[PDB]
Nucleic acid binder design. Structure first.
Ligand SMILES: [Mg+2]
Ligand SMILES: [Mg+2]
Ligand SMILES: [Mg+2]
Lengths: 249, 255
DNA sequence: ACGAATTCG
DNA sequence: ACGAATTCG
């Protein structure tokens, strides 16, 4: 019993080349055919595109206006049981926490995504949001496997300020030994989309999990969306993360 | 006049006089000088002095010896009342990472039968430069601690501090006190920069800060007596001498 | 969605 | 020399 997924901030707020870039995202999704896709910065017409292009997935969204997150669940692999949205009462960017309860065969999951408050300036609110996420991860029954995957905008120091990850919550990248090839998910040296004429890189996109001992084992982690499209730009200013995991009973 | 009874007292003004605003500057300098004439402080600590402003001080505050923190741009100064203060030396300590030509100016003097190290600075400005401002504060506090134990150390200047930043510094050292805090945090002189009450910068909003502060090293030998704002009167041009209020402080040196 | 600089109210 | 918003590099 395995589960595979992609998490990706697809920069729907960039209107430039957006249709081509959306098609680019989905060409990448088609190659890997993940069980679950967690998306951030979806906008309404992008969601409308996904409802047709990804009609083979159940699509759950974090809002209906502005920009928002989504979780796509592969029909026939993933059974959708419920969705839950938890607000971030002090967000200035309409951010929230989107959760879905699902099963794959006999295994129950709570899958969660968010786009935490952006920029250095909003560190304090981002930390409060992270605490909300970690709190929610603890609520599921012990028998349920909890996975958060999303755009956290985190700096390592902010996780320390937060108290560090709890003893029963793990970061998939850390678990896999901090591989260098997929460390940075936002990198202005390698990615030209924002036209930032400087080199900055961050591990903004992260995966946290809580599972009974050895019931969830990350197997691989890889960057996706690394190829330029016809327009000479990438699907997004972020790279996506493709993760495969086994559920070991 | 300063007679026998007041011989144990040092009085001073600290004031960022906004020499970077050239508009109405000569009239505003005359306003500052009128205040100095009224209170006749022993020492004046100034920030944002520019070279033309030194000429205005030589004309309208001629009884003060002027010691400056630099020769060009904008800089601090310490003014010493002739006949009261004996000038012994001046020291300038750089702030190697300043982006605003800031530094620490110290003047060693004798006054009223006591040796003093008088210090001023204009610490790095704006919220954005908090980290550098904190580094500079540490330099200042370190220098206050280094002075010979017999000397009385007083810093007065424009610190640009927010209260949270002093905490991040770990707070003032054990033998260093803030004069305003010492006097019980009086409300009348709490804010030294206030855009509701002062319109020189034409900021269309109401913000207020205790940017200008006085620190002293002491045990029981230096006792603040009073702290008051100055420069709260509009001049003929309808503007204040500066965007900051000045602070007038008197301290007693005790056996 | 970087840090630095600048504009706006 | 404010904070927020925007622009610049
Ligand atoms: Mg973005
Ligand atoms: Mg593997
Ligand atoms: Mg100023």
């Amino acid at each position: 019993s395995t589960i595979s997924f992609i998490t990706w901030n697809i920069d729907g707020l960039d209107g430039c080349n957006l249709p081509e870039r959306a098609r680019g995202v989905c060409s990448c999704l088609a190659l890997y055919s993940p069980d679950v896709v967690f998306l951030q910065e979806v906008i309404p017409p992008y969601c409308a595109y996904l409802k047709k292009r990804a009609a083979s997935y159940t699509i759950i969204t974090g809002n209906e206006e502005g920009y928002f997150t989504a979780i796509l669940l592969k029909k026939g692999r993933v059974k959708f049981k419920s969705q839950e949205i938890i607000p971030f009462p002090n967000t200035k960017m309409m951010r929230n926490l989107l959760c879905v309860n699902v099963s794959l065969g006999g295994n129950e999951f709570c899958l969660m995504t968010s786009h935490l408050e952006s920029t250095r300036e909003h560190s304090a609110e981002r930390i409060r949001q992270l605490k909300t996420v970690l709190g929610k991860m603890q609520e599921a029954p012990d028998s349920t496997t909890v996975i958060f995957a999303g755009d956290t905008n985190l700096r390592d120091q902010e996780v320390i300020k937060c108290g560090g990850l709890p003893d029963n919550v793990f970061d998939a990248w850390e678990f896999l030994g901090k591989p260098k090839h997929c460390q940075y998910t936002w990198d202005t040296k390698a990615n030209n989309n924002l036209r930032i004429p400087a080199a900055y890189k961050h591990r903004f996109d992260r995966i946290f999990f809580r599972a009974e001992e050895g019931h969830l084992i990350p197997q691989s982690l890889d960057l996706v969306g690394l190829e330029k499209l016809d327009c000479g730009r990438f699907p997004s200013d972020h790279w996506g993360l493709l993760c495969t995991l086994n559920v070991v009973l």
